[PDB]
Design an enzyme around this catalytic site. Structure first.
Site, PDB file in Angstrom:
ATOM      1  N   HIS A  79      -2.819  -1.886  -1.355  1.00 11.48           N
ATOM      2  CA  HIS A  79      -2.466  -3.088  -2.132  1.00 11.48           C
ATOM      3  C   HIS A  79      -2.952  -4.357  -1.450  1.00 11.48           C
ATOM      4  CE1 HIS A  79       1.066  -0.462  -3.706  1.00 11.48           C
ATOM      5  NE2 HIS A  79      -0.004  -0.310  -4.470  1.00 11.48           N
TER       6      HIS A  79
ATOM      7  N   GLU B  36      -2.231  -2.746  -7.209  1.00 10.74           N
ATOM      8  CA  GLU B  36      -3.220  -1.672  -7.396  1.00 10.74           C
ATOM      9  C   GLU B  36      -4.635  -2.231  -7.365  1.00 10.74           C
ATOM     10  OE1 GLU B  36      -1.763   1.808  -8.094  1.00 10.74           O
ATOM     11  OE2 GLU B  36      -0.303   0.397  -7.211  1.00 10.74           O
TER      12      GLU B  36
ATOM     13  N   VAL C  27      -0.986  -0.900   5.917  1.00  7.44           N
ATOM     14  CA  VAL C  27      -0.719  -1.905   6.937  1.00  7.44           C
ATOM     15  C   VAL C  27       0.572  -1.541   7.679  1.00  7.44           C
ATOM     16  CG1 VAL C  27       0.283  -4.269   6.977  1.00  7.44           C
ATOM     17  CG2 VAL C  27      -2.108  -3.888   6.286  1.00  7.44           C
TER      18      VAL C  27
ATOM     19  N   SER D 105       0.840  -1.235   0.000  1.00  9.22           N
ATOM     20  CA  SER D 105       0.000   0.000   0.000  1.00  9.22           C
ATOM     21  C   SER D 105       0.852   1.253   0.000  1.00  9.22           C
ATOM     22  CB  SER D 105      -0.916   0.004   1.216  1.00  9.22           C
ATOM     23  OG  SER D 105      -1.569  -1.250   1.343  1.00  9.22           O
TER      24      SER D 105
ATOM     25  N   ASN E 161       4.254   1.013   3.704  1.00  3.24           N
ATOM     26  CA  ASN E 161       4.430  -0.214   4.483  1.00  3.24           C
ATOM     27  C   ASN E 161       5.771  -0.278   5.185  1.00  3.24           C
ATOM     28  OD1 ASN E 161       2.789  -1.581   1.714  1.00  3.24           O
ATOM     29  ND2 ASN E 161       1.816  -1.369   3.725  1.00  3.24           N
TER      30      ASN E 161
END
EC number: 3.5.1.93
Lengths: 158, 522
Positions: B23, B455, B70, B1, B244
């Site tokens: 993601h 994506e 995340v 992400s 991330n």
């Protein structure tokens, strides 16, 4: 100072869907919009949503058999379906009405469109506010935070 | 992400910019994103959320927006128990388990259910599990007493001011995630959010492992308030980002260091090449338009090629094997972008799988290790050129076997295929440095591969008045058997041809193709 443009005041409850199947949900109040949102999600994703909610009642194994059993065992053992019931009761009354509306929207889509609901997720219906709370609770605490793989000593490929 | 938020001062027009870019798996139930727009007389929200969530997790409206990545917030502990005498050893004493006998039904092939017993045992720590190897493990999950996760997100995304947003975030009902915020007032914010147990000792690695379960010394009971966690607000750099990576370069220049927080919140491991690209793409660019912001999101640099090829190539041209020599020449002529028409890219991937392991994250092959002091330009170089050339030798084999040639175009092997829509791929693995991410599958027997993860929802928002936003959803807005709204976006994705996201009522009316009136009474 420069204020944002005027908000729109919905005078009736409607979903205006665009060409890509994006629902624009207009409600005259919060529970309306949430109902509209549950309706729309069930239109677009009903089968999987219902499957997922069934799992979060800890009823995966019962509805769909052995491929669902380990998640059942993980979630019952972590008392997820019952904590969801508690969490539901512990919601503020205003927000509890939003969750009830969302579940109602899901149920009402399935009612007015039974042909769109895959046979073996039908047994899941009706869904409730607690169902919605339970799935969110599995997602956040028992998929993201504590995955079964980290505890049981496993995990998924690349 | 990925997540960017850009302060007004860093933009041409003087309004904040926001990137939503999670993601996740393209093929997984609960990870599927959905796009919607909710309007009442009192609030408005637009964006994406995982199916079955009644609140939008990636939200924006005319005033504000948020996004999520995340962060791995260690919110649980696995405890190794010492089984003894029917109970378990704890503070020098054998202590019995709590036991309850529960049951569940299991559906049998013939449509009936049998009734199945299920003992549930708990220690002080939490519920107990037996691993296939015999280790008895008790899992202790933080924040089981936080029932307001949904309403917290709802209150955050409908916040009337940054202060209201912050007050909502401070309830500690959302147990995880990096969360980034931007608004029309000009405020941008990064928070390393989640519910983190207070611990008196041990670093993150100790807490991620099996903690000994034979002592109250390790039994935590309390959690950190929001202002114990890494946060950044309107930093001097004029932007915040997260890809991330550990929370130590959320902006440039940094506003804190790892020693300002307990060591168990987040790791101090090398930053992925995608994360390094995130920091430079933002910090090196001023006077951003929304257009330029969007173009930056498409970045697909093969950063690892930049770090290794200057050493690999001269070493390889020395090798006697003409095929190795030709591989080196192909690699050297490459512009090091993951374009559809690249003839060197697949080949480079295969060498990188050997040079840095299958997930491209290994560090041992580099001459200069990643360093906190040059955090977007390390690790660098090839430690053992001879060994790496041997890796190129094996990689030539692997490329030919997988794809049929050492020089097949990237986007001929790399396809995005949904229903009967088949379009050329571009971009690639985050760990090679590609910002826009497509985690390509292993190829099929014809060397065609597709994204397994990458994506999904991509939106970019400028908080002008009115707001301007553009988005795409890779796998469409529906996944019901027979929907026309599954494969109807991927071609646009292949051309990076983003939809204008329609918020204002007049725009929605111009674009409507179905009206569903509904009426709800409790």
């Amino acid at each position: 100072p420069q204020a944002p443009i005027a908000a729109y005041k919905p005078r009736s409850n409607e979903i205006l869907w665009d060409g890509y199947g994006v629902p624009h949900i207009y409600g005259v109040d919060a529970p309306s919009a949430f109902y509209g949102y549950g309706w729309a999600q069930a239109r677009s994703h009903g089968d999987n949503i219902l499957r997922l909610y069934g799992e979060a009642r800890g009823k995966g194994a019962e509805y769909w058999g052995p491929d669902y059993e380990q998640t059942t065992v993980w979630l019952l053992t972590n008392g997820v379906p019952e904590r969801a019931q508690q969490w539901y009761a512990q919601q503020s009354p205003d927000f509890r009405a939003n969750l009830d509306a969302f579940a109602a929207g899901i149920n009402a889509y399935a009612q007015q469109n039974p042909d769109d609901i895959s046979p073996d997720v039908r047994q899941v219906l009706p869904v409730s506010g607690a169902d919605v709370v339970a799935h969110a609770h599995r997602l956040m605490n028992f998929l993201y935070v504590a995955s079964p793989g980290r505890t049981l000593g496993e995990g998924d490929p690349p | 992400s990925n997540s960017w938020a850009v302060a007004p001062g860093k933009t041409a027009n003087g309004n904040a910019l926001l990137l939503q870019n999670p993601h996740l798996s393209w093929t997984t139930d609960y990870f599927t994103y959905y796009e919607a727009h909710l309007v009442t007389p009192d609030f408005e929200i637009y964006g994406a959320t995982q199916i079955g969530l009644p609140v939008i997790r990636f939200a924006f409206n005319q005033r504000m927006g948020i996004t999520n990545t995340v962060n791995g917030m260690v919110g649980a502990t696995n405890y190794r128990l010492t089984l003894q005498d029917g109970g378990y050893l704890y503070d020098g004493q054998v202590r019995p388990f709590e036991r309850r006998q529960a049951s569940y039904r299991l559906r049998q092939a013939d449509g009936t259910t049998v009734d199945k017993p299920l003992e549930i045992r708990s220690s002080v720590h939490g519920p107990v599990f037996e691993r296939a190897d015999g280790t008895a493990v008790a899992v202790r999950v933080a924040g089981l007493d936080r029932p307001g996760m949904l309403e917290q997100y709802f209150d955050m995304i409908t916040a009337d001011s940054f202060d209201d947003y912050e007050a909502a975030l401070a309830r500690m009902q959302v147990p995880t995630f990096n969360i980034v915020y931007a608004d029309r007032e000009g405020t941008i914010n990064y928070s390393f959010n989640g519910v983190a147990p207070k611990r008196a000792e041990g670093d993150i690695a100790f807490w991620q492992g099996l903690v000994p379960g034979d002592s109250s010394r390790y039994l935590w009971t309390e959690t950190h308030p929001l202002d114990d966690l890494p946060r950044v607000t309107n930093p001097p750099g004029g932007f915040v980002q997260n890809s991330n990576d550990p929370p130590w370069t959320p902006t440039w220049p940094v506003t804190y260091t790892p020693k300002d927080f307990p060591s168990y919140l987040a790791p101090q491991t090398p930053h992925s090449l995608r994360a390094q690209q995130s920091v430079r793409l933002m910090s090196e660019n001023d006077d951003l338009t929304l257009e330029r912001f969007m173009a930056l999101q498409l970045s697909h640099r093969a950063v690892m090629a930049d770090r290794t090829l200057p050493d690999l190539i001269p070493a390889a041209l020395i090798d006697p094997d003409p095929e190795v020599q030709a591989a080196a020449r192909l690699l050297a002529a490459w512009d090091r972008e993951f374009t559809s028409d690249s003839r060197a890219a697949l080949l480079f991937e295969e060498w990188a799988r050997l040079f840095a392991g299958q997930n491209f994250a290994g560090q041992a092959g580099f001459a200069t290790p990643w360093s906190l002091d040059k955090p977007v330009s390390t690790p660098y170089g090839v430690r053992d050129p001879k060994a790496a050339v041997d890796q190129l030798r094996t990689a030539i084999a692997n490329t030919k076997r997988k794809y049929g040639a050492i020089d097949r175009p990237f986007g001929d092997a790399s396809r995005m295929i949904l229903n009967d829509v088949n379009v050329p791929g571009a971009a690639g693995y985050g760990n090679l440095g590609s910002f826009r991410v497509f985690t390509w599958s292993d190829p099929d027997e014809n060397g065609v591969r597709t994204p397994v993860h990458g994506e999904t929802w991509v939106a970019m928002i400028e908080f002008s008045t009115p707001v301007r936003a553009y988005g795409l959803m890779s796998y469409g807005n529906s996944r019901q058997p027979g929907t026309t709204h599954y494969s109807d976006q991927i071609e646009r994705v292949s051309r990076a041809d983003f939809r204008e996201l329609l918020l204002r009522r007049e725009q929605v009316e111009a674009a409507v193709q179905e009206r569903t009136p509904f009426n709800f009474k409790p």
